[PDB]
């Protein structure tokens, strides 16, 4: 789920380039 | 308030983030 985690709280490029 | 980043979304609009971050990460 990655909705709560930008909805919710902070996931900036430096976070969601990690998701990939 | 507008300030660097929060906003952000919640479904779909997440499925389209991978899509254009594993793009720019490398389209390759």
Not at chain 2, 1 to 19: K, S
Not at chain 2, 23 to 28: L, P, Q, R, S, Y
């Amino acid at each position: 789920g990655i909705v709560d985690e930008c909805c919710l709280r902070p996931c900036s490029v430096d976070v969601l380039l990690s998701y990939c | 308030q507008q300030p660097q980043a929060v906003h952000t979304y919640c479904g779909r609009h997440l499925a389209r983030t991978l899509a254009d971050l594993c793009w720019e990460a490398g389209v390759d």
